[PDB]
Design a protein around this ligand. Structure first.
Ligand SMILES: [Mg+2]
Ligand SMILES: [Mg+2]
Ligand SMILES: [Mg+2]
Ligand SMILES: [Mg+2]
Ligand SMILES: [Mg+2]
Ligand SMILES: [Mg+2]
Ligand SMILES: [Mg+2]
Ligand SMILES: [Mg+2]
Ligand SMILES: [Mg+2]
Ligand SMILES: [Mg+2]
Ligand SMILES: [Mg+2]
Ligand SMILES: [Mg+2]
Ligand SMILES: [Mg+2]
Ligand SMILES: [Mg+2]
Ligand SMILES: [Mg+2]
Ligand SMILES: [Mg+2]
Ligand SMILES: [Mg+2]
Ligand SMILES: [Mg+2]
Ligand SMILES: [Mg+2]
Ligand SMILES: [Mg+2]
Ligand SMILES: [Mg+2]
Ligand SMILES: [Mg+2]
Ligand SMILES: [Mg+2]
Ligand SMILES: [Mg+2]
Ligand SMILES: [Mg+2]
Ligand SMILES: [Mg+2]
Lengths: 211, 224, 157
RNA sequence: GCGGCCCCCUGGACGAAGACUGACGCUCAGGUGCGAAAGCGUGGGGAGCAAACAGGAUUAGAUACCCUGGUAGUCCACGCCGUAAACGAUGUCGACUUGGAGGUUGUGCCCUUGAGGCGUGGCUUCCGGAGCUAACGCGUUAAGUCGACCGCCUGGGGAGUAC
RNA sequence: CGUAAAGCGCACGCAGGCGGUUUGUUAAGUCAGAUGUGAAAUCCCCGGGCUCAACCUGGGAACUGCAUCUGAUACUGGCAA
């Protein structure tokens, strides 16, 4: 049927929030709107920088943006120039001063967003959907995912009738709340429409929780 | 072992005439009161030869699997097998213990994981009810695989009680070339057994006689 | 090191409430090229998985054949179901003369010079079984001398 | 194919112990004979049953179906016919090969014999191993292992039809 | 040749096919050897000549047969017991 968002159901249990700040009702909406604009701009500007996660915090009258990426050197540029320009424009978008930090994701093949981006890019760049998804699971299991599942959906290969197909290796318990299931999604805009790709990666359970 | 020793224990009795396998004709002395009497003249020398071969196997670091799942003799088989640093199966033989050794290995890995976890800790990271549930699972697995939990690889020989009762294990052994020594009563089929010991297979006293002889010879081979 | 050859791939189907479920079967043969040959047969939803199951099965269930310098010891008949196979030793230079199913088995087995022919049903799955059985029952002069309680030349010479 | 009881004539089978003949045996093209039922010819007989038939409820039609009668026939004597899922869908005969539970019919020995326990034959039913088979299955009454002779088979339809 | 096409409905039985075991004899079948013959060309083997090949050609093998003679006597047949 219809399943709950894994990250959504697990938020506060074994998953952290992407945005972490306090604000009264007078400015909560404004903060959300600024967050949306900043994330949109950064995602588009760094589309080719393998950005995995944009954590926005709002210390006092400032905004700290942490970009989890698998390619820190591209984002940074020679001696910080690119970070500087990104910060200078994020400060414009937010209004308050801004600071940018870069966190490398050591093993991108275990990152759901990066896996989805790779598969989407391949599909747009004209590759066999079965080959692409099988290659990403194999790589994920090789790098050590306790489990992985990929679901491609919609007019695969230009077929007139859209179909859904999914591969799954290992174990991906989605009803276990203490399980660590990094889930993300991507859409491939191809000449015959939108192809949706969902990726779940199970990377062990958390007992102590630690939120 | 002595001919008198076996006769005293009653090795010579067998099943009824109506329930017999014709292939066991050479080892049957005759019939009295519609009950078959096994030939102990066949039993004693064959048992000695089985002891000698088992001595060689045990003397070359051989792994011996004692198998008998009769409710009468399971406890005796467990104790006798443990007395000689060997391995046993005392409850219902799982089909595929040898041919599906990969899945049995998965079960052994599960057992080791569970006890390592239950002694390192993490049960304090689990609800007391989850702790009890995992303990119950560990107990069941220990009952199922306690005798072979540390066998490590494929056994080097099988000793079997009531070949008919354990024919599945004999079939896997035949497929895998593992030599089978088996106590084969008049009603059983001796074709699948490399070393058939023709004698009673029910009486606990006779079972203990066979097992004690086997364990003594195994310890002789082990001591070196 | 062992050489493996896929003889035939076939698609089967099973009918269930919703409709037809398609699967595949794979027949493969592995050999050491020096008288040891095994055959395997696997099933799976997809062809590569079926072939891999077949390879794994084929590595076990293998037997030894007492070859003689790349040719057979003596003419042999094999029989399984409706597949009756006939093989005979051949002189050097002949090569492998056989139908495809027998050709693959003999090539991976290492019989360099053999004349073969299949009679009756040429169903590959049973032709392979009958060829394997025929090659298995084929004995050697040393084994027949051992059986008969004499020496080699006492049979040969 | 054979079904109350009795009598007259007659065929076949099986067992026990012996005596006798001394290869006199097996198979069989053509040929001869027997061959359910329906059917035909002659003449009887004809209770019940019953093709055909007739009637009784009966729509552009009664043919159906159900009831009421009911002839041939079914029975007998003599001829003819000569076909059937005439099936165990398994040609005849001989030899070898692990068992079990029954049935039926002889016959020997032994317990104290009646009951009962040990054998030894014939025919026969059901399970089942090896083996064989495409499988199903067959399995000492083989469809196993062989031998002798005979009868057939060669895509389906046309067709067991035409001449 | 149980069910895929294929065991006559069944029995007797002439011609025909086959036939238990021992001894002798026979040399019919059978085997061995030899002789004659199996035309030449063709096929095959070793060579030779056209610049090679096709082609021509030397010698041989073969032509599995038939007939006769002398031998062998296990098996089948005849005869005798
Ligand atoms: Mg819902
Ligand atoms: Mg198999
Ligand atoms: Mg064919
Ligand atoms: Mg006739
Ligand atoms: Mg009549
Ligand atoms: Mg009449
Ligand atoms: Mg009437
Ligand atoms: Mg009427
Ligand atoms: Mg009349
Ligand atoms: Mg007709
Ligand atoms: Mg007819
Ligand atoms: Mg009848
Ligand atoms: Mg009948
Ligand atoms: Mg018929
Ligand atoms: Mg006759
Ligand atoms: Mg049966
Ligand atoms: Mg006609
Ligand atoms: Mg038919
Ligand atoms: Mg008949
Ligand atoms: Mg004659
Ligand atoms: Mg004779
Ligand atoms: Mg002559
Ligand atoms: Mg000539
Ligand atoms: Mg020249
Ligand atoms: Mg010439
Ligand atoms: Mg004679």
């Amino acid at each position: 049927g219809q399943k709950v968002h894994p990250n959504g159901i697990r938020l506060g249990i074994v998953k952290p929030w992407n945005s972490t700040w306090f604000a009264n009702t007078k400015e909560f909406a404004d903060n959300l709107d600024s967050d949306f604009k900043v994330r949109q701009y950064l995602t588009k500007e760094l589309a080719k920088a393998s950005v995995s996660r944009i954590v926005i915090e709002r210390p006092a009258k400032s905004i700290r943006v942490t970009i989890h990426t698998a390619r820190p050197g591209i984002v940074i540029g020679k001696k910080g120039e690119d970070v500087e320009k990104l910060r200078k424009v994020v400060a414009d978008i937010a209004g308050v001063p801004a600071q940018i930090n870069i966190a490398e994701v050591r093993k991108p093949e275990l990152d759901a967003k990066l896996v989805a981006d790779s598969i989407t890019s391949q599909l747009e760049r004209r590759v066999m959907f079965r080959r692409a998804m099988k290659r990403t699971v194999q790589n994920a299991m090789r790098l050590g995912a306790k489990g992985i599942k990929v679901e491609v959906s919609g007019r695969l290969g230009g077929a007139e009738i859209a179909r859904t197909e999914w591969y799954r290796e290992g174990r991906v318990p989605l009803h276990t709340l203490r399980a660590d299931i990094d889930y993300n999604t991507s859409e491939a805009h191809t000449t015959y429409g939108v192809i949706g790709v969902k990726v779940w990666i199970f990377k062990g359970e958390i007992l102590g929780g630690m939120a | 072992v002595s001919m008198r020793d076996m006769l005293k224990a009653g090795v010579h009795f067998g099943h009824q005439t109506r329930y017999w396998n014709p292939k066991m004709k050479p080892f049957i002395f005759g019939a009295r009161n519609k009950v078959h009497i096994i030939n102990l003249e066949k039993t004693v020398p064959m048992f000695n030869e089985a002891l000698a071969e088992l001595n060689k196997i045990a003397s070359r670091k051989g792994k011996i699997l004692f198998v008998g799942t009769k409710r009468a003799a399971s406890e005796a088989v467990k104790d006798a097998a443990l007395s000689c640093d060997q391995f046993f199966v005392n409850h219902r033989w799982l089909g595929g213990m040898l041919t599906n050794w990969k899945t049995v290995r998965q079960s052994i890995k599960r057992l080791k994981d569970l006890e390592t976890q239950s002694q390192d800790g993490t049960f304090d990271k689990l609800t007391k009810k989850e702790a009890l549930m995992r303990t119950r699972e560990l107990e069941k697995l220990e009952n199922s695989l306690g005798g072979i939990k540390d066998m490590g690889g494929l056994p080097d020989a099988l000793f079997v009680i009531d070949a008919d009762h354990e024919h599945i294990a004999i079939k896997e052994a035949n497929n895998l070339g593992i030599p089978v020594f088996a106590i084969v009563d008049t009603n059983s089929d001796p074709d699948g057994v490399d070393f058939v010991i023709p004698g009673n297979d029910d009486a606990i006293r006779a079972v203990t006689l066979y097992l004690g002889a086997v364990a003594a010879t195994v310890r002789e081979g082990r001591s070196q | 090191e062992l050489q493996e050859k896929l003889i035939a791939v076939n698609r089967v189907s099973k009918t269930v409430k919703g409709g037809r479920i398609f699967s595949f079967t794979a027949l493969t043969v592995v050999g050491d090229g020096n008288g040891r040959v095994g055959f395997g047969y696997g099933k799976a939803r997809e062809v590569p998985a079926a072939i891999q199951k077949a390879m794994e099965k084929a590595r076990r269930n293998m037997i030894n054949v007492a070859l003689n310098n790349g040719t057979l010891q003596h003419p042999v008949k094999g029989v399984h179901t409706g597949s009756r196979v006939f093989m005979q030793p051949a002189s050097e230079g002949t090569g492998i003369i056989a139908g495809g199913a027998m050709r693959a088995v003999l090539e991976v087995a290492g019989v360099h010079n053999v004349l073969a022919k299949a009679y009756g049903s040429t169903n590959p799955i049973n032709v392979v079984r009958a060829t394997i059985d025929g090659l298995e029952n084929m004995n050697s002069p040393e084994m027949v001398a051992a059986k008969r309680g004499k020496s080699v030349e006492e049979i040969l010479g």
